């Protein structure tokens, strides 16, 4: 029942500062423009210990499955090859991606009827808000 309140189908309804986050990450111009336009559907499900998070959009359909605390290899939507570890900290899913001596952290939290996604790369934060689909 560890992630019950995350499970479901969610749709992006707002984004703030995502271009700057993507610049900080190293995303190039064309990908920033097209990916920044995307309005993804996030689908979260749990089966036993395995959590699956799908992101479906006009830009790319991606999917990760993982066990909390157990590192995995992830190809991101911008084609970074990263090592990822996702944990639960105080009811917040904390997703750290490592690559090329760099790190970014993505936090996902339930707040009221929303799922809030906070993306941090050094001093830059982007906040993306999802609501139930
Ligand atoms: C097509 C797409 C565009 C933006 C996305 O935002 C991520 C927020 C979490 C960031 C994950 O890693 C990145 C970093 C940069 C880009 Cl351009 C896409 C994903 C989200 O909303 O789940 C997802 C998908």
Swiss-Prot record:
Protein name per the record: Fatty acid-binding protein, adipocyte
Keyword set, alphabetical order: Acetylation, Cytoplasm, Lipid-binding, Nucleus, Phosphoprotein, Transport
- Provide the leader sequence positions: none
Q: Which cysteines are joined by disulfide bonds?
A: none
Q: Mind telling me which SUPFAM superfamilies this protein's record contains?
A: Lipocalins
Known PROSITE patterns for this protein?
A: FABP (PS00214)
Output a single Gene Ontology CC term carried by this record. Answer: nucleus
Q: Which residues carry this modification: Phosphoserine?
A: 14
Superkingdom classification of source: Eukaryota
Q: Any keyword Acetylation?
A: yes
Q: Which Gene3D superfamilies match?
A: 2.40.128.20
Q: Name one GO molecular function term.
A: long-chain fatty acid transmembrane transporter activity
* Description of its domains: Forms a beta-barrel structure that accommodates hydrophobic ligands in its interior.
* A Pfam short name: Lipocalin
Assembly, in brief, is: Monomer. Homodimer. Interacts with PPARG.
List the ranges annotated as motif Nuclear localization signal.
23-33
Q: Give the similarity note.
A: Belongs to the calycin superfamily. Fatty-acid binding protein (FABP) family.
Q: Which residues carry this modification: N-acetylcysteine?
A: 3
Q: What does this protein do?
A: Lipid transport protein in adipocytes. Binds both long chain fatty acids and retinoic acid. Delivers long-chain fatty acids and retinoic acid to their cognate receptors in the nucleus.
Give the UniProt record's GO annotations in the biological process aspect. Answer: brown fat cell differentiation; cellular response to lithium ion; cellular response to tumor necrosis factor; cholesterol homeostasis; fatty acid transport; long-chain fatty acid transport; negative regulation of DNA-templated transcription; positive regulation of cold-induced thermogenesis
Query: Which parts of the sequence bind a fatty acid?
Result: 128-130
Residue list for modification Phosphotyrosine: 21
Cellular localization per UniProt = Cytoplasm; Nucleus
Where does this chain mainly localize?
cytoplasm
UniProt entry tagged with the keyword Glycosyltransferase: no
């Amino acid at each position: 029942h560890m992630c019950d309140a995350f499970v479901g189908t969610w749709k992006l309804v707002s984004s703030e500062n995502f271009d700057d986050y993507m610049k900080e990450v190293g995303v190039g111009f064309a990908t920033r423009k097209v990916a920044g336009m995307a309005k993804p559907n996030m689908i979260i499900s749990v089966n036993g210990d395995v959590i699956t998070i799908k992101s479906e959009s006009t830009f790319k359909n991606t999917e990760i499955s993982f066990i909390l605390g157990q590192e995995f290899d992830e190809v991101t939507a911008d084609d970074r090859k990263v090592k990822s570890t996702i944990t639960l900290d105080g009811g917040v899913l904390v997703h750290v991606q490592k690559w090329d001596g760099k790190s970014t952290t993505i936090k996902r939290k339930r707040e009221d009827d929303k799922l809030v996604v906070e993306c941090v790369m050094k001093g830059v934060t982007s906040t993306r808000v999802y609501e139930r689909a």
